[PDB]
């Protein structure tokens, strides 16, 4: 059934699973035409497929060419997501294939179930959690590879950097969701927090800066405040 607050910790057991988020697959800018009508221009997108135990991120870049000549693009985008997740699973050796796939939006269940009929043993699950994976395009290096892509492309990342050498996957996921929740609620503030100290750099093979344990605590606290703050600014509390 559904992944929620009660069974949260199943994400960190030893059964391979993936989260799939499709919120950045189909992306458009809305503009005015010369005649004063409105039209969309698509820009490159990405499927966010994450193993929460290992941090392994399979970033499938959705190039705008996949939309050419197609209709009902918001609906196509869910089936294209499912088509690409299915292809990923097929490409993996049997012992690396997920035992469960958790979609962050219920509208993905039928497209993915259908594309995964060949895998009756892989459970397709929704979730009641409001996870901040839409903010993945606020991570500079991920947005950069998406926007620079001239063809379909799969890029592999560890979204936890090296954190698992020092903390558990539960704690790494909590850190990531806090970072992404902050970037979603106020990207400018959030990014200011992360990069204000020029002496803390991002390694070439990392996504986030090389904070010490003590500096992550400060960072993490500053991200909480931001989220609480914006909650007041937003609600007047």
């Amino acid at each position: 059934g559904a992944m929620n607050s009660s069974n949260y910790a199943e994400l960190f057991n030893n059964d391979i699973k993936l989260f799939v988020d499709d919120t950045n697959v189909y992306r458009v800018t809305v503009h005015k035409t010369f005649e004063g009508n409105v039209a969309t221009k698509a820009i490159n997108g990405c499927i966010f497929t994450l193993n929460p135990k290992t941090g392994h991120l399979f970033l499938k870049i959705i190039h705008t060419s996949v939309w050419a000549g197609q209709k009902r693009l918001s609906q196509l985008a869910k089936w294209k997501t499912a088509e690409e997740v299915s292809a990923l699973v097929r490409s993996l050796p049997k012992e690396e294939q997920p035992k469960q796939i958790i979609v962050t939006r219920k509208a993905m269940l039928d497209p993915l179930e259908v594309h995964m009929l060949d895998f009756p043993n892989i459970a397709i699950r929704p979730t009641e959690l409001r996870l901040p994976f839409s903010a993945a395009m606020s991570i500079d290096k991920l947005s950069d590879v998406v926007m620079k892509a001239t063809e379909p492309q799969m890029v592999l990342f560890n979204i936890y950097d090296d954190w698992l050498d020092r903390i558990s996957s539960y704690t790494a996921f909590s850190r990531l969701t806090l970072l992404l929740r902050a970037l979603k609620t106020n990207e400018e503030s959030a990014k200011m927090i992360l990069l204000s100290d020029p002496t803390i750099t991002i390694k070439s093979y990392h996504l986030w800066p090389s904070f010490t344990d003590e500096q992550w605590i400060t960072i993490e606290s500053q991200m909480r405040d931001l989220i609480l703050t914006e909650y007041g600014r937003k609600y007047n509390v």
Binding site: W79, A82, L117
Partner: protein, 300 residues
């Protein structure tokens, strides 16, 4: 005109024959039903006064044999049986008629309800859905489960309806996932019509038989088959034009005949609203949509 002679009526029972129902009191001198139209299948069904649980009944065709009902006090039900000695049969029926101990199937110049409900239903197909090859008639009841229901427990007592699953490999071609799931024409026309049913009449026959089992016996799995066969047509963008027109007539009479007070359990809100108002065929069922809106506007 054909006859179904009853040895007796030892227990109080509501007896139904197609869309008709009537009450027979315990040990009332009742010896059957006369004037049954030849040329159609029929169903004779039963609900005991003392245990309205288990509606049960027999599908039959009088052209295939001489059939009668006799109560079995060990198994506790009205059983259909076949009498092969045609002479001994005619005699017993004639005696019963002369003493006027039979009720009569009604006939009117203005009625085609039963024909319209059973138009494509054929005893030979019923006997493949309900397996019991030693008899020429077929027993159904409230509790019997379908093969599909069994998959998701005794197989000999199952309703062998055609499995219809929209999220199955049978329904979905590799490489046409979105196409085949959103437009089910391939599954309707190639898999089911050309492949399994062979023609639309056999398809409509199973659809009509599932409806009738749902209505007369409150057979849950039958209702599921009925809704699934409707939905497969309604969710298909390409349907032979003759099939759409015939479906509209089929469903019109089903809706017309449904008891007003049973609409709450035999009509799937999701399927009907989808079929009438969202599906490819939302504008192709004019008669059915007009009777649904005037009779059951609440469901919609």
């Amino acid at each position: 005109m054909n006859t179904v002679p009853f040895t007796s009526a030892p227990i109080e029972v509501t007896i139904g024959i197609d869309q008709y129902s009537f009450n027979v009191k315990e040990n009332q001198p009742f010896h059957g039903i006369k004037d049954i139209p030849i040329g159609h299948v029929h169903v004779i069904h039963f609900q005991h006064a003392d245990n309205s649980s288990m509606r049960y009944g027999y599908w039959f065709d009088c052209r295939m044999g001489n059939f009668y009902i006799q109560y079995d006090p060990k198994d506790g039900l009205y059983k259909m049986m076949e009498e092969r000695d045609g002479a001994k049969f005619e005699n017993i029926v004639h005696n019963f008629k002369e003493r006027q101990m039979m009720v009569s199937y009604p006939k009117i110049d203005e009625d085609d309800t039963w024909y319209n409900l059973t138009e494509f239903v054929q005893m030979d197909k019923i006997r493949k859905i309900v397996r019991k090859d030693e008899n020429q008639f077929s027993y159904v009841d409230s509790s019997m489960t379908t093969v599909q229901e069994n998959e998701l427990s005794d197989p000999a007592h199952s309703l062998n309806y055609t499995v219809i699953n929209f999220k199955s490999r049978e329904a979905i071609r590799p490489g046409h996932e979105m196409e085949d799931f959103l437009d089910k024409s391939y599954y309707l026309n190639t898999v089911m019509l050309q492949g399994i049913f062979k023609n639309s009449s056999n398809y409509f026959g199973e659809l009509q038989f599932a409806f009738l089992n749902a209505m007369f016996f409150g057979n849950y799995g039958s209702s599921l088959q009925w809704h699934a066969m409707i939905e497969l047509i309604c969710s298909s963008a390409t349907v032979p034009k003759h099939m759409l027109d015939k479906l509209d007539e089929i469903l019109y009479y089903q809706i017309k005949t449904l008891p007003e007070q049973y609409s709450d359990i035999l009509l799937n809100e999701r399927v009907w609203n989808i079929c009438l108002y969202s599906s490819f065929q939302k504008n192709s069922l004019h008669n059915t949509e007009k009777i649904m809106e005037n009779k059951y506007p609440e469901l919609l």
